[PDB]
Subunit: 226 residues, 4 copies
C-alpha cells in the first residue's frame, strides 16, 4: 500500500528535457507575427505542459513520505511555489491585469536549477554565503539612506529630474555607485549651478567604493578559510 | 553614592529603536507638501528626540566612571561629536546659513553603527586596515597631483571646461581614473585639436589602473596572512 | 628510411621571426594608398609566406611519426586548421564573398601562441580552468535568457530600438550587465513611460553583478588550492 | 682625503621638505594672473631650486665611493636622469619647442619616491611583479593587434572616425576594453549599418575581459605563494 520505489535514471532526465522545450516555446512565442498566426497550438501546448509539471510535482509529493519531511525541505517549497504561480497565471488568465501576469509564464523554466543536482548544490552554496556578508549590507543600506536624504534636500530645486524625492533620488544614488555616467550627466549639470556640490559625489563615490571593495575582500578571505 | 549598575538588556535596544524612528521621521520630512502641512508636530518631535539623545549620552557619561577612561575611548568621542553637531544645528537654527546646517539634522542616524556591537566591531576592523594601505595612497596622491599639474598647462586654452585650474582639473582627473566617459566626452573633443594629446590619457588610465589593481591585491594577501 | 632527427635550435626561432614579419606586412597592407600603389609585391609575398607555412607544417607532419600520435594532439590540429583557413582564403580568393574572407588572412599570426612554448603552456593552462567554472556559466546563461524573454514582452512597444526581439534584446541585456550606460540611455528614456520599469534593471543589475562577483571568487579560491 | 662620513638624520628630511616646497610652487605657477604678476621671483626660485638639487645629487655622487657601485645602482641613475631633464629644460629653455618642455619642470617632484625609503621599497616591489605577469601581456598585445587589424578593414568606410587607420583604431580598441561607452557610441551607430558587426564587439569584449580577469588572478595567487 505504501509507495516504496519511485526513482530511476530518466526520472529527472525527462523532466529537464521537457523544461528545455518549455523554454524554447515560451521564447518563440514572443514574436508578434508567428505567435499571432498559430495561437491554438501554443494555447494547447502551454496547457499540457502546465499539467505535466503539475502531475510531476504531485507524484513526487505523494511518493515523498508525506508525514515526514517533504514540505520541510525548502527546495520543494520553491518548486511548489513556481507551479502555483503558473496556476495563478492560468486560472486568473486575462481579466485585465495581464501585463505583469504573462511574465510568470516564464520563470517556470528556472526550476531547472532545482532538478539538475549540480546547479542545486551550487545555488545552495551561493546562498549560504549571504549570512556571511550580513553586516556589510546593513552598513551599505545605512550609507545609501543617509546620502539619499542628504541629497534630496540640497538639490531638490535645481535638478528635479534626478533628485526629486526620497524614492527617485534613491535611484540616482544607485546609478552612481556603479560609476555609470556619474560625472557627465549627473554632476556636471548640477555642479554648474551649486558649485560646492562636488563634495557630495567625490565623497560618496569614494566611501561607497571603499565599502564595496572591502565587502568583496571580506568574502575572498573567507573561502580560503572555509 | 557611586553609580554601580546601569546596564541591562534593552539598555541599547530602546536606543536603536528610537534611532530607527528618528531616521523614519527625518526621511519623511523631506517631502514639501507633507512637511509644510504639519510643521508644529515635526518641530516638537525633533526637539524631544534631540533631548532624548542628550540625556542618553549624558547618562552614559555620568555612569561611565568619569575620572577613568570614558573620554579616552574614541567611540564615545564620536557619539559626543554627533550630539554636539545636532545641538549646533538647534541653537544656531536658522540665522541664514541653514542650507549646510539642516544636513547635520541627518547624520544623527549613523550613530547606529556605534550602538549595535556587530557594526561597531566591523567598522573598527575596516578602519584598522587604513594604516595597512598607507603608502599606496601617498603614491596615488603624488600621481594625481603630477598629472593634474601636467594637464592644466597643456590643455588650458583648448578645453577651459575640464582643464581650467589646478582645482577643476583635479576633478577631470578623478572622473577619468574611474573610467567614466573618459574617452567620449573628455578626450575625443580634445584629441581632435591637440592630436598628440592621447599620450596623456593612455598613459594615466594605464598607470593609474595598475596602481589601483596592486592596491587591491596589497590588501587581499594581507588578510590571508592576518 | 625513417626520419629520425629533425629538430634544432632555430627550428622554431626562424618560424616565429617569419610570423612576426607576416604580422608586420598584413598590418601595413591595411592602408589604402600604400597598398594600392604596390600590389604585385604584396601579392607575391603573401603567396610565398603561405607556402612557407604550408611546407613547414607539412615537414612537421611527415617527421612526426605519422601512425603514432601527431594528429592526436590538439595543438597540431589547431595549427592545421589555421593553415587550411589561409588556404581557403587563397583558393577561394575573390569570387564575391571576400569581406569576411580577407579576415582569415590575419589570424595566421596568432599561431604564434602555438610555437613559443611559454605562451603554449599559458594558454593551455587558461583553458584548463574553463571546466572549473562550468556550472556558473550555465546559471548565467539561464539568467540572461530569462531576463531577455521577460524584457522583450514588456518593453516591446515602448522601446523598439533596444527591446525589439529575443535576439536584439539579448544585446541590450549584455551592454547592461557590463554597466555600460545602463541608466542614462537604456533606462531613463524607458522608465519615463512605464514608471514601474525600474524594478527590472535594479533587479538584473543587482543579481547579475552578484553572480559575476561570485564567479570571480569561485576561481580565486581554486588556485590557492590548486 | 677620503670622504668617510656624510650621512645624518635630516640628510634626507631637508631634501624631502624642499621637494614638497618645489611641488607647491610649481603648482601655484599654473595660474595665469598670479604667475604673470610675479615672474622674476618665480624665475629666481626655480633657478635656485634647480641648483640645490644639482649640488645635492653631486654631493651624493662624490661621497658615494665613485669607483665602486654608485652608478651601478638603478635608483641613482633615475635621480640623475631627472636632474638632467630639469637641466635640459633650463639650458634649452624657450627656443620654440617649449610646450612639451615646461612639462619636465614638473616631474622633478616625483623623485620624492626615491628619497623616502618606504616609497622606494614599495615601488621597487611593485616593479618586481612586472616580470611575473610577463607572458600575459604578450598575449594581450597579440590580441589587441589582431583585433585592430581585423577592425580597420571591415569598418573603414562606414565609421571613419573610430576605425580609420591601424593607429586610430588601436584607440577605439582601447576605450572599449575598458568598457567605456563601447555600446552607445562605438557600436550602435555602426551596428546600424553593417548589421553583423555585433559579432566583433561581443567577441572582443568577451575574450579581452576573460584575459584581464585571469591576469588579475594570476597575480593574486602569486603573493599567497610569495
Ligand atoms: C537550459 C535553459 C537555458 C535556456 C537557453 C536557451 C535554450 C532554448 C533556446 C531557445 C531560442 C529561442 C528561439 C527563438 C527563435 C525563433 C526563430 C525566429 O524567430 O526566426 C525569426 C527570424 O529571425 C532571424 O532572422 C534569426 C532568428 C535567430 C535569432 C534567435 C536568437 C537565439 C536565441 C538563443 C538564446 C540563447 C540563451 C543564452 C544567451 C547567452 C522569424 O521571425 P521574422 O522576424 O518574422 O522573420 C521572417 C523569416 N521568414 C521569412 C523565414 C519567415
Ligand atoms: C560608514 C558610513 C560613513 C558615514 C559618513 C558619511 C558622511 C556624510 C557626507 C556628507 C557630504 C557633505 C555634503 C554637503 C556638501 C554640499 C553642500 C552644498 O553644496 O551646499 C552649499 C555649500 O555651502 C557651503 O559653503 C558648504 C562648504 C563645505 C561644507 C561641508 C559640509 C560638511 C557637513 C558635516 C560633515 C560631517 C563629517 C562627519 C561627521 C562625523 C552650496 O551653496 P549654498 O549655501 O546652497 O548657496 C546657494 C546656492 N548657490 C551657491 C547657487 C547660490
Ligand atoms: C537602520 C537604519 C537604516 C535606514 C533604513 C530606512 C529605515 C526607515 C525608512 C524610512 C523610509 C522613509 C519613508 C518616507 C515615505 C513617506 C510616504 C510618502 O512619501 O508617500 C508619498 C507618495 O509617494 C508614493 O507614492 C510611494 C511612497 C513610497 C516611497 C518610499 C521609498 C522607500 C524608502 C525606503 C529606503 C530604504 C533604505 C535602504 C535603500 C537600499 C506622499 O507624498 P505625495 O507625493 O504628495 O503623494 C500623495 C499621496 N496621497 C494622495 C495619498 C496623499
Ligand atoms: C608612480 C608614479 C609614476 C610617475 C610617472 C608619470 C609619467 C608622467 C607622464 C607624462 C605624460 C606625457 C604627456 C605629454 C604628452 C602630450 C604633449 C602634447 O600633446 O603637446 C604637444 C605634443 O608635442 C610633441 O611633439 C610631443 C611628442 C611626444 C612627447 C612625449 C612627452 C614625454 C615627456 C617626458 C617623459 C618622461 C618619462 C619618465 C621620465 C622618468 C601637442 O602639439 P603642440 O606642440 O602643443 O603644437 C601646438 C598644438 N597643435 C598641435 C594644435 C598645433
Ligand atoms: C608578436 C606579434 C604581436 C604583434 C605586435 C606588432 C608587431 C608588428 C607591428 C607592426 C606595426 C604596423 C606598422 C604599420 C605602419 C606603417 C607606416 C605607416 O602607415 O605610415 C603612414 C603614416 O602614418 C603616420 O604618420 C604614423 C605611422 C605610425 C603608426 C603605426 C602605429 C603602430 C602600430 C604598432 C602596433 C603594436 C601592437 C601592440 C599594441 C598594444 C603612411 O601612410 P599615410 O597616411 O599616407 O602618410 C603619408 C606619409 N608620407 C608623406 C611619408 C608618405
Ligand atoms: C539564479 C537565477 C535567479 C532568477 C531570479 C530572477 C527573478 C525574475 C525577475 C523579474 C523582474 C520583475 C520584472 C517585472 C517588473 C516590471 C513590470 C512592469 O513594469 O509592468 C507594469 C507594472 O505593473 C505593476 O503594477 C507591477 C508592480 C510590481 C510587480 C512585481 C513583479 C514580480 C513578478 C514575480 C516575482 C517572482 C519572484 C521570484 C519567484 C520565485 C507597468 O505598468 P502597466 O501594468 O504595464 O500599465 C500600462 C503601462 N503604463 C504604466 C504606461 C500605463
Ligand atoms: C608630497 C607630494 C605630493 C603633492 C601633494 C600636494 C602638496 C603641495 C600642494 C599644493 C597645492 C597647490 C596650491 C595652489 C593654490 C594657490 C591658491 C590659489 O590659486 O587661489 C586662487 C583662487 O582659487 C580659489 O578660490 C581656491 C584655491 C584653492 C584651490 C587649490 C586646490 C588644492 C590643490 C591641492 C592638491 C592636493 C593633491 C592631492 C589630490 C588628491 C587665486 O587665483 P584667482 O582665480 O585669480 O582668485 C582670486 C582670489 N583673490 C581675489 C583673493 C585674489
Ligand atoms: C588568445 C587570443 C585568441 C584569439 C581569438 C580571436 C578570434 C578572432 C575574432 C574574430 C571576430 C570575427 C569578426 C567578423 C564578424 C564581422 C563580419 C561582418 O560583419 O561583415 C559582414 C558579415 O558577413 C557575414 O555574413 C559573416 C557572418 C559570420 C562570419 C563569422 C566570421 C568568423 C571568422 C573566422 C572565425 C575564426 C574562429 C577561430 C579560428 C581558430 C557584414 O556584411 P557584408 O558582407 O560586409 O555586406 C555588406 C555590408 N552590408 C551588410 C551593409 C550590406
Ligand atoms: C572628500 C574628498 C576631497 C579630497 C580633497 C583632496 C584635495 C581637494 C582639492 C581642493 C579642495 C577644495 C578646492 C577649493 C574649491 C572649493 C570650491 C570651488 O571653488 O570648487 C571649484 C572646483 O571644485 C573642485 O575642484 C573639486 C576638487 C575635486 C577633488 C578631487 C580629489 C580626488 C581625490 C583623489 C582620490 C584618490 C586618493 C584618495 C585620498 C583620500 C569650482 O568652483 P569655482 O572654481 O569657484 O568656479 C565656479 C563654479 N563653476 C565651476 C560651476 C563655474
Ligand atoms: C604609453 C602607452 C602607449 C602604448 C604604445 C603602444 C603602440 C602605440 C601605437 C602607436 C603609437 C604612435 C602612433 C603614431 C601616431 C602619433 C601621433 C598621431 O598621429 O596620433 C594619431 C592617432 O594616435 C593614436 O593612434 C594613439 C594610439 C593609441 C595607443 C593605444 C595602445 C593601448 C595599449 C594596450 C594596453 C594593453 C597592453 C599594455 C602593454 C603596455 C592621430 O593623429 P593623426 O593620425 O595624424 O590625425 C590627425 C589628428 N586627428 C585624429 C585629430 C584628426
Ligand atoms: C529589488 C531591488 C529593490 C530594492 C528595494 C529597496 C527599497 C526601494 C525603495 C522604494 C521601492 C518602491 C518605491 C515606491 C515607488 C514605486 C513606483 C514608483 O512610483 O516609482 C517611482 C520611482 O521609483 C524608484 O524610486 C525606484 C527606487 C530605486 C531603488 C534603488 C535601491 C538600490 C538598493 C541598494 C543596493 C545596495 C544594497 C542592496 C540590498 C539588497 C517613479 O514613479 P513616480 O514617483 O510615481 O513618478 C512618475 C514616473 N516618472 C518618474 C516617470 C515620472
Ligand atoms: C561569440 C559570442 C556570441 C554568443 C552567442 C549566444 C547566442 C547569441 C544569439 C543569437 C546569435 C545570432 C542571432 C541571429 C541574428 C544574426 C544576424 C542578425 O540579424 O543580428 C540581429 C541582432 O544581432 C544580435 O541580436 C546579437 C545577439 C547578441 C548576443 C549577446 C550574447 C551575450 C552572451 C552572454 C555572455 C555571458 C555568458 C557567456 C557564455 C559564452 C540584428 O539584425 P536584424 O535583426 O536582421 O535587424 C537589422 C539590423 N539592424 C538592427 C541594424 C536594423
Amino acid at each position: 500500500k505504501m509507495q516504496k520505489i519511485v526513482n530511476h535514471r530518466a526520472f529527472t532526465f525527462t523532466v529537464i528535457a521537457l523544461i528545455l522545450f518549455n523554454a524554447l516555446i515560451v521564447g518563440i512565442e514572443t514574436y508578434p507575427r508567428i505567435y499571432a498566426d498559430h495561437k491554438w497550438l501554443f494555447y494547447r501546448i502551454d496547457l499540457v505542459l502546465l499539467w505535466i509539471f503539475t502531475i510531476e510535482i504531485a507524484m513526487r509529493f505523494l511518493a515523498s513520505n508525506p508525514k515526514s519531511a517533504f514540505f520541510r525541505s525548502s527546495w520543494n517549497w520553491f518548486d511548489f511555489l513556481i507551479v502555483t504561480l503558473s496556476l495563478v497565471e492560468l486560472f486568473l488568465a486575462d481579466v485585465e491585469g495581464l501585463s505583469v501576469l504573462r511574465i510568470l509564464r516564464v520563470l517556470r523554466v528556472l526550476r531547472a536549477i532545482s532538478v539538475v543536482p549540480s546547479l542545486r548544490r551550487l545555488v545552495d552554496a551561493l546562498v549560504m554565503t549571504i549570512p556571511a556578508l550580513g553586516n556589510i549590507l546593513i552598513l551599505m543600506s545605512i550609507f545609501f539612506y543617509i546620502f539619499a536624504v542628504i541629497g534630496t534636500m540640497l538639490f531638490q530645486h535645481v535638478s528635479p529630474e534626478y533628485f526629486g524625492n526620497l524614492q527617485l533620488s534613491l535611484l540616482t544614488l544607485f546609478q552612481v555607485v556603479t560609476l555609470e555616467s556619474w560625472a557627465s550627466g549627473v554632476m556636471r549639470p548640477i555642479f554648474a549651478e551649486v558649485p560646492w556640490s562636488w563634495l557630495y559625489f567625490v565623497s560618496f563615490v569614494l566611501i561607497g567604493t571603499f565599502i564595496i571593495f572591502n565587502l568583496f575582500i571580506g568574502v575572498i578571505v573567507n573561502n580560503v578559510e572555509k
